[PDB]
Amino acid sequence: SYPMTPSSLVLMAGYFSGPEIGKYMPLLFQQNTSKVTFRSGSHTIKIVSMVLVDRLMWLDKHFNQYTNEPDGVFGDVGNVFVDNDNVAKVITMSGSSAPANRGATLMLCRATKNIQTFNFAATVYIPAYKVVVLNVAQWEANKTLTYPAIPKDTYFMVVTMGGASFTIQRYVVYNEGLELPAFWGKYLSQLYGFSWSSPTYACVTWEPIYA
Amino acid sequence: SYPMTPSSLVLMAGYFSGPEIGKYMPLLFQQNTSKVTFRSGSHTIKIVSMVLVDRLMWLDKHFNQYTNEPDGVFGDVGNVFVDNDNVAKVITMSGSSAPANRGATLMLCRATKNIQTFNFAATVYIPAYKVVVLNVAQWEANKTLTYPAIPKDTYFMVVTMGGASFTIQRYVVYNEGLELPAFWGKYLSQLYGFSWSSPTYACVTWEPIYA
């Protein structure tokens, strides 16, 4: 018995997959329309990445497996919308409150209903260090992006990013549609990086201190 | 009891660190001199990365921990030299034998003696996808690179890379001093990527099939 607490640093480990189009390619996207959005209060923001997880494991900083799950430990701070359907609850977020003019936020969601396949046009981007900054380099404009059906109770991650931010509880939520300070690579690791064909993880808790 | 076999896919997980100079920055280097080298038979090749691991764990593709260690399972296929001192044994290698004109090889070493601090000038590089290819972008020329003392029996990883290759058993060993095909990102994951401040892993076995 090793329960995660609301103070725990929790990793979402497993085999990550993004949208059918860059298989195994960690990618970001800028939707042409507002098809998938994080909503909370007055905020409606377009997400820039959606990632599903097979073989999910909740791990701590030392890769020891937690015996409970985030739903139940962390309270909901928002929702993910597909069009105007409220399809998922945002459970917790990862990122930094360190002051920055540009940044990104990770969000752990859980499908609240069975979610049906959806698709959308988007520009596809590859985030990569560039000589150092985190460069969001455009790959190809106007590609169709599909997501398979996501069952109920299925966890998944979304990302938002931009040069504006608002807060939800302590979470700093970046938004808008780019070069981010290299500082952000820690918060997007190990998820974004070279490959989703090999297993990886995303931190799902705020301000992860790996020290 | 879950022993790795010579047929096992084995991940080296832990907190990785490279040379004191890019803290937490996954980097490659091109030594100015032949200070650290992989040697085997007639081959003497300059390594392009050396990575130490704290909190090491041997994991399988599903992040289940092996109960034995690579030394003893895999046979030695070469050595790491610091100047002309034979300081480590290469136990196993990761990479691909898929035909390519440019590539990289990972090597799991084990210090065979207590190894003393060493330093060397090198150009420092950041490997990153570039719009797609794996670009080895130069950061800064002529930086001093230090490695702390490495005890005996300490595991560590070295990398070689280039547009030439030779084989040692089935291992394809890339060498010379760059744009690599994006195919290579899988084999360098999750090690290379955004951050070594968060825990990560390198595959230490040949032709990892994560499927």
Side-chain angles (χ1 to χ4, degrees):
Chain A
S1 178
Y2 178 37
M4 73 185 63
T5 82
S7 81
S8 286
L9 185 160
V10 185
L11 306 179
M12 195 176 209
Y15 287 81
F16 286 72
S17 34
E20 299 200 352
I21 326 188
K23 273 158 204 147
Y24 324 120
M25 216 71 150
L27 71 76
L28 302 171
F29 50 81
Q30 165 126 297
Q31 319 170 53
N32 282 21
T33 56
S34 317
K35 212 294 199 303
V36 196
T37 52
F38 170 72
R39 291 178 200 220
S40 189
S42 54
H43 309 294
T44 299
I45 66 175
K46 282 150 82 193
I47 60 139
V48 300
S49 196
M50 184 162 159
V51 175
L52 322 177
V53 194
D54 300 319
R55 207 265 306 133
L56 157 72
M57 299 169 36
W58 303 110
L59 301 180
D60 68 1
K61 64 204 105 33
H62 291 129
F63 286 171
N64 312 148
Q65 182 170 13
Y66 286 114
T67 54
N68 63 343
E69 63 188 299
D71 188 26
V73 177
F74 310 90
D76 108 89
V77 281
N79 292 90
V80 164
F81 274 56
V82 171
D83 315 294
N84 283 305
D85 263 26
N86 186 337
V87 295
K89 72 172 171 214
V90 177
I91 297 171
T92 178
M93 303 216 174
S94 196
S96 187
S97 317
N101 305 113
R102 271 151 185 208
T105 310
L106 316 185
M107 293 180 209
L108 179 66
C109 324
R110 212 192 186 179
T112 40
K113 72 182 270 282
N114 302 293
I115 315 177
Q116 293 209 303
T117 170
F118 59 89
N119 35 74
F120 53 96
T123 296
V124 165
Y125 298 91
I126 286 149
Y129 286 137
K130 156 150 208 253
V131 175
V132 171
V133 296
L134 208 161
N135 186 264
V136 185
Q138 164 184 322
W139 193 8
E140 260 277 294
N142 252 297
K143 310 263 280 293
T144 292
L145 268 74
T146 305
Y147 280 89
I150 294 162
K152 182 179 186 143
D153 284 10
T154 291
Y155 286 96
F156 65 94
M157 306 259 311
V158 292
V159 179
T160 60
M161 167 180 305
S165 69
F166 59 89
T167 71
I168 310 205
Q169 311 314 125
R170 70 182 66 204
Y171 307 134
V172 179
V173 185
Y174 289 90
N175 66 94
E176 284 169 357
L178 191 60
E179 148 230 296
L180 298 183
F183 163 80
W184 288 106
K186 176 165 119 178
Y187 303 92
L188 286 285
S189 67
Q190 298 288 324
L191 182 48
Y192 297 92
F194 283 168
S195 177
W196 281 345
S197 56
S198 48
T200 183
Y201 66 81
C203 178
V204 295
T205 49
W206 201 246
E207 212 77 58
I209 323 191
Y210 292 104
Chain B
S1 178
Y2 178 37
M4 73 185 63
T5 82
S7 81
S8 286
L9 185 160
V10 185
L11 306 179
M12 195 176 209
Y15 287 81
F16 286 72
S17 34
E20 298 200 352
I21 326 188
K23 273 158 204 147
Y24 324 120
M25 216 71 150
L27 71 76
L28 302 171
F29 50 81
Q30 165 126 297
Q31 319 170 53
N32 282 21
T33 56
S34 317
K35 212 294 199 303
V36 196
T37 52
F38 170 72
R39 291 178 200 220
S40 189
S42 54
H43 309 294
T44 299
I45 66 175
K46 282 150 82 193
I47 60 139
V48 300
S49 196
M50 184 162 159
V51 175
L52 322 177
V53 194
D54 300 319
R55 207 265 306 133
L56 157 72
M57 299 169 36
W58 303 110
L59 301 180
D60 68 1
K61 64 204 105 33
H62 291 129
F63 286 171
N64 312 148
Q65 182 170 13
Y66 286 114
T67 54
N68 63 343
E69 63 188 299
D71 188 26
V73 177
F74 310 90
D76 108 89
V77 281
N79 292 90
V80 164
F81 274 56
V82 171
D83 315 294
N84 283 305
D85 263 26
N86 186 337
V87 295
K89 72 172 171 214
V90 177
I91 297 171
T92 178
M93 303 216 174
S94 196
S96 187
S97 317
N101 305 113
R102 271 151 185 208
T105 310
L106 316 185
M107 293 180 209
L108 179 66
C109 324
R110 212 192 186 179
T112 40
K113 72 182 270 282
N114 302 293
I115 315 177
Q116 293 209 303
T117 170
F118 59 89
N119 35 74
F120 53 96
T123 296
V124 165
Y125 298 91
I126 286 149
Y129 286 137
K130 156 150 208 253
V131 175
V132 171
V133 296
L134 208 161
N135 186 264
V136 185
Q138 164 184 322
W139 193 8
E140 260 277 294
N142 252 297
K143 310 263 280 293
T144 292
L145 268 74
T146 305
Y147 280 89
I150 294 162
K152 182 179 186 143
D153 284 10
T154 291
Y155 286 96
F156 65 94
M157 306 259 311
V158 292
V159 179
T160 60
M161 167 180 305
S165 69
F166 59 89
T167 71
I168 310 205
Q169 311 314 125
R170 70 182 66 204
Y171 307 134
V172 179
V173 185
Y174 289 90
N175 66 94
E176 284 169 357
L178 191 60
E179 148 230 296
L180 298 183
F183 163 80
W184 288 106
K186 176 165 119 178
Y187 303 92
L188 286 285
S189 67
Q190 298 288 324
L191 182 48
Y192 297 92
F194 283 168
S195 177
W196 281 345
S197 56
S198 48
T200 183
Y201 66 81
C203 178
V204 295
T205 49
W206 201 246
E207 212 77 58
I209 323 191
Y210 292 104

